[PDB]
């Protein structure tokens, strides 16, 4: 049940004008693809607060990447999910050598130590509404906020989105469960920045779990592991939203395109 949204003033939509022409933003099956423009970020701001919605943020952060985290938690306290309820999800090998990092009202941090763990799925069930997976060794510079919250979202590979589909590096054997002929895909997303309700989540990362297991059982491992097994799943099971690279980049690599108004998640040189 969704309460009715107070009285707001902003722009009209105009029907007669396209959102960006320089970019695709809504998918073949009708999912946006979240670009800078295509959205009201109060509208949904005020959608979502409603809703009282809960956010869980995960990391795995293991040996040397747990020098990553500082900035890292300090980055996305100003400008992941700011003003909704954040749970932090920290998956690490050195507890002892998380650092203390002050966040705001309304947010929270769990140290999860892994050898496997001793936390228990049902876990984000009960506590978050979604769950956003992503790279530990990235900062965020600029705005990442409810715009991504749906069932299930990919990113695009800041490398290849612009890439015909045969140039994508999906696994192309087929013997691979995460087996893609050069005649199928709809874009190359990367593992490093997805997620979607719990409940999708965890039947993503179990499928994933499983193809993985097969693949070991044939004798074969894919060639970009996690990720070939996510562009897979992602092309069988279509997301809901896809975000852009402004999501997932790498300025160092990739500059700074004109199709990019805004650099929000990227990797830390
Ligand atoms: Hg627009
Ligand atoms: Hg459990
Ligand atoms: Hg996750
Ligand atoms: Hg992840
Ligand atoms: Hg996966």
Known sequence: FMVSLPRMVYPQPKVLTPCRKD???????????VWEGTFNIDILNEQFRLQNTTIGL??????????F???????????????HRVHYYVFTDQPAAVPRVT??????????????????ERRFLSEVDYLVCVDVDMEFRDHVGVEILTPLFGTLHPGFYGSSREAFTYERRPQSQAYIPKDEGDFYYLGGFFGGSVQEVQRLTRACHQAMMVDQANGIEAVWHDQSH??????????????????LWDQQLLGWPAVLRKLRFTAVP
């Open 103 to 120: 966040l705001g009202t309304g947010r929270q941090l769990s140290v999860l130590e892994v050898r496997i763990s001793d936390f228990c």
């Open 230 to 247: 996510l562009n897979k799943y992602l092309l069988r099971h279509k997301p809901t939203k896809v975000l852009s690279p402004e999501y």
């Open 58 to 67: 995960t990391v795995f952060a293991i040996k040397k990447y747990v020098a």
């Open 23 to 33: 970019v695709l933003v809504v998918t073949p099956w009708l999912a946006p693809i």
């Open 69 to 83: 985290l500082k900035l890292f938690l300090e980055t996305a306290e100003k400008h992941f999910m700011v003003g």
